[PDB]
Amino acid sequence: VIPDFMSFTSHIDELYESAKKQSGGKVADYIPQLAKFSPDLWGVSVCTVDGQRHSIGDTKVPFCLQSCVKPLKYAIAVNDLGTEYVHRYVGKEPSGLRFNKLFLNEDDKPHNPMVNAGAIVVTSLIKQGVNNAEKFDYVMQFLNKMAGNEYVGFSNATFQSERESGDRNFAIGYYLKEKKCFPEGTDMVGILDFYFQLCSIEVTCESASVMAATLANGGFCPITGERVLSPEAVRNTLSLMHSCGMYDFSGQFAFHVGLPAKSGVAGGILLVVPNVMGMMCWSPPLDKMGNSVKGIHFCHDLVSLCNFH
Amino acid sequence: FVIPDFMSFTSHIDELYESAKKQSGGKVADYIPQLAKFSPDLWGVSVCTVDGQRHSIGDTKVPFCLQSCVKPLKYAIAVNDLGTEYVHRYVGKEPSGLRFNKLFLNEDDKPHNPMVNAGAIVVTSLIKQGVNNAEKFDYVMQFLNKMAGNEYVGFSNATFQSERESGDRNFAIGYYLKEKKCFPEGTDMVGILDFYFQLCSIEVTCESASVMAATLANGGFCPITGERVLSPEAVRNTLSLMHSCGMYDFSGQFAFHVGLPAKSGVAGGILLVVPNVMGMMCWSPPLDKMGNSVKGIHFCHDLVSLCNFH
Amino acid sequence: FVIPDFMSFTSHIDELYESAKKQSGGKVADYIPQLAKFSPDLWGVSVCTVDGQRHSIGDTKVPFCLQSCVKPLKYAIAVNDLGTEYVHRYVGKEPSGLRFNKLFLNEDDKPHNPMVNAGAIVVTSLIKQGVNNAEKFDYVMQFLNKMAGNEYVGFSNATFQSERESGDRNFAIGYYLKEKKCFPEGTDMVGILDFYFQLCSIEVTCESASVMAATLANGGFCPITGERVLSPEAVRNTLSLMHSCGMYDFSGQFAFHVGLPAKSGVAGGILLVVPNVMGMMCWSPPLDKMGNSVKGIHFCHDLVSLCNFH
């Protein structure tokens, strides 16, 4: 794909230093398990679709996939069930408001699988009729296949704090239950618990870069070469990420970078350059809107230097 | 040389034309006689690549007005004349998530994007401040003629009169914008709305609109004459805005199925751009419930299902 | 060093491993699918001397949950944090003489020992009072990482969920203890039970568990790092409790044959300590009718027959 992973790596290693010289803002402070990471942590990982890899910085420190798991769970649900069944319950258009807003569209359905309501509904669609242990096992095996048997684990310390502080998520779940937005025969409390478990899965920059690369490749793992996702699933996931991946900021992002990227509250930016590569940027500092300052600066510098877009 | 066949491509184009011709249609205007006089049987397609290759099928010689297909063009003109930083100082770039005619602004008291009515009015105001309306219209007309490669671009007086005597929602939006002080210093709101109504009444043919879209596809260089008419930044911003909020609230769903920058007009015209490949204009007066031609939507869906694109 | 040669001893350990490998086995879990998916062929042994020397034979890199081998560690943590006199104010120090999952207290209406389920629940309640479960788990994990010499210690979520929806007897025991006022003032029983289920789901390998047993044998000093992790009173009380009722109603027979402090879990794990000598961990999913690994029991018996120890 890139016949210059030498000078290209030099460009990456200079954008890294360019983005390192930032102060930024806060980290998180909503749970103690994320307001502990040192602000000076800053790492970048890149995996091309041909298997070539390159990492620079603190790319070996595990961190939770707080909000970067929504594209992956949506892809899993679409692959298991299908586009028409998955979108029978959720929409495919941006809402124009914050991700934690308590309102539905004109059809009394969640606007998209990227807002909290859509994410909860999509979580309710995975492996119906089975207990949470088997659901978690299935999702973890799918993620291990996605990342090419890299480091994927569970952070129980984050899961306990997140589970006892999701009042807005509980309100959204009860609102969805009252409006009959769930498939028949679903326990809302168990669905919310499984959602909290999924949000607590932790990876490094290497495994996240491999996941982004396998999304770019079209369901084929660049390292192993095993098909993990159907083309329809990855295409729909990329479309959703481009449309409403950054919530109300998304359009502005598409105005400047124009690439499918997803941002988490743990200071993680997972971006995909289709047919080219997948990258993960980690910087626990966050700005006022909810994105890592170093990650956003790196994305802007990357799109300014190389054409991409 | 981007598509070096133009024989099987045109064959598939005609096949899709015939397939989409079977659609019944729908209500066209039902509110004014100017747009209600067009028979539903009219349906034409025009394709122009970035090499000068042209192909027109159906009835592509019947002029029609550019109701909402002129917003990307006026935004591109404003960006080219002024600059991205200045033009986006007054309007936003994120989709609103509601109808195009809703009376509300974002957290910065600015129009959400140049594609909504308020954004279009502000962008119209931004063009050639402190000049007579006749000079502004002449400038825009010559810019459109240069962009279309000296094709047929004209004016429809009856349509302009109908819009100016029927469009009071735009007057409400303009007064609301003037109250919030969203206009540049030293502008007249009534003249701005008159110029907006004049711009909305410009009429073109299908081949001229296809060349106009192919100009954006090529990157500011006219596929026919080869003269540079737009800066690359203006074309890039126009394409980004069209992909984000080209079809308003429905736009995202469009991007889920077709995934191409397209703009829809009240006069049943779909102007779509395949970047670095080509541009198409599909005219079909009959409209669906949300203001889009059923034949144009069906043609776009069939095309994206046939060829890879997206 | 404790073992001057550590070369013939390694050969003896290998011979013991091969001798014990010939056993057929039995059932594994039969109650949850997380522990029922392990193949019977898995069989590993890890030995760590108090001076840092290590030796592992077999599948010693496969993680497994510390089902019932965490009770000595949690009791040691509680004693180190609080004190011997405060910890035993709530639990006894004598064998009950019956099964571990028995709903009865001694003459003082207290759990018989910290090894039965009631004593384990009370000791869990005694750890880090007045704090939420997240910080309790963080503290316990930090203590285990310090004790294990920064080896592999992690969490198994699927096993944890299985325990949550499979632990009816533990809920009955917790309610029985709550009725009899066996808990410290200001405690939520359901939170204590959830924390107990979390603690039982911590997973390690044979290497880390061997290191933990080595620190227990060394008197709170980790053989690898050399950092004091436990007080002498804590390790002495833990060893005394393990020797008294480590294997429940079978423990006496163990003390009649092996005579070493050992703890057995339902995940096919035997954690044994030879004081002032070394610590060992044996893993074999195959279990007998009494809840012990057949390979581990055979290995322990033949080891105590070959070398003096006892």
- Whether B1 has its CB under 8 Å from any CB of chain A: the answer is no
Distance CA B32, CA B29 (A): 6
Q: E strand or H helix at C178, and its extent?
A: helix C168-179
**Dist. CA A254–CA A240, nearest whole Å:** 12
Alpha-carbon B298 to chain mean position: 19
Sort strands B44-49 and C153-155 into parallel, antiparallel or unpaired. Answer: unpaired
User: Do chains C and B touch, with touching meaning 3 or more CB–CB pairs less than 8 Å apart?
Assistant: no
Q: Are A216 and A272 in contact (CB under 8 A)?
A: yes
Tokens of C177: 């203890």
Instruction: Locate C199 and state its tokens.
Output: 């603690």
Technique used by the depositors: cryo-EM
- Which residues, in sequence order, are CB contacts of A181 under 8 Å at separation 6+? A89, A104, A108, A109, A110, A117, A121
Beta bridge partners of B155: B202
| C 8-37 near A (Cβ less than 8 A) | 33-34
Beta-ladder partners of C264: C270
Rounded Cα distance, B295 and B306, in Å: 16
Q: What is the 3-state secondary structure (H, E, C) of C86-132?
A: HHCCCCCCCCCCCCCCCCCCCCCCCCCCCCCHHHHHHHHHCCCCCCC
Chain A residue at shortest CA distance from B107: A97
Q: Collect all residues of chain B within an 8 Å Cβ-Cβ radius of residue A91.
A: 253
Domains and CATH numbers, chain C: 1-310 (3.40.710.10)
Token representation of residue C114: 């910290």
- Annotation: binding site of A for substrate: 67, 116, 162, 169, 195, 247, 265
| Nearest chain C residue (CA) to A163 | C134
Chains C and A touch (3+ CB pairs under 8 A): yes
Put simply, whether A144 touches C (Cβ < 8 Å) is no
- Quick count: other Cβ atoms within 10 Å of Cβ B106? 15
Mutate to test the interface with A, among B96, B256, B258 (most CBs of A within 10 A): B256
- Any A CB within 8 A of C162 CB: yes
Our CA angle for B73, B74, B79, nearest 5°, is: 100
Q: What residues of A form the annotated binding site?
A: 67, 116, 162, 169, 195, 247, 265
Of C275, C270, C290, the C-alpha closest to C67 is: C270
User: How far apart are alpha carbons B246 and B295 in whole angstroms?
Assistant: 18
Q: How far apart are CA A195 and CA A123, in angstroms?
A: 6
What are the backbone angles phi and psi of residue C278, rounded to the nearest 5°?
A: -175, 175
Rounded to whole angstroms, the Cα distance separating A144 from C124 reads 34
| Contact C145/A at CB under 8 A | no
| DSSP-derived secondary structure letter, A303 | H
To probe the interface with A, which of C32, C132, C157 has the most A CB atoms within 10 Å? C157
> How far is the CA of A2 from the CAs of A123, B220, C232, in angstroms?
37, 29, 61
Q: Which long-range contacts (CB under 8 A, 24 or more apart) does B158-163 make?
A: B158/B34, B159/B34, B159/B35, B159/B65, B159/B201, B159/B203, B160/B197, B160/B198, B160/B200, B160/B201, B162/B32, B162/B34, B163/B197, B163/B200, B163/B201
Task: Please name the chains neighbouring C, where neighbouring means 3+ C-beta pairs under 8 angstroms.
Answer: A
CA dihedral A270, A272, A78, A202 (to 10 degrees): -20
Say how far apart CA A43 and CA A207 lie, in whole Å. 13
The amino acid at residue A173 is G
Q: Which residue does chain A place closest to C164, by CA atoms? A: A133
Helices (H), A147-187: 156-163, 167-178
Pair C262, C292: CB distance under 8 Å: no
Name residue C153's beta-bridge partners. C204
Distance (Å) from the C-alpha of residue A218 to the closest C-alpha of chain C? 30
Both tokens of residue C34? 């997380």
- Helical (H) or strand (E) element with A144: helix A132-146
B88 Cα distance to chain centroid: 19
Paired tokens of A93: 């258009």
Chain Cα centroid distance, residue B209? 9
Closest CA to B149 of B72, B205, B74: B205
The reply to whether residue A136 touches residue C161, judged by beta carbons under 8 angstroms, is yes
Chain B residue with minimal CA distance to A244? B252
Say whether the A–B interface has 3 or more Cβ pairs within 8 Å: yes
Sort out which chain A residues have CB atoms less than 8 A from C158's CB and list them: 133, 136-137, 140
Rounded to a whole number, what is the distance in Å from the CA of B116 to chain A's nearest CA? 14
C68 is in an annotated binding site: yes
Query: Closest-CA residue in chain C for A33?
Result: C134
CB pairs < 8 Å spanning A and C: 46
Partners of A244 on chain B (C-beta within 8 Å) are 252
Query: In units of Å, what resolution does this entry have?
Result: 3.1
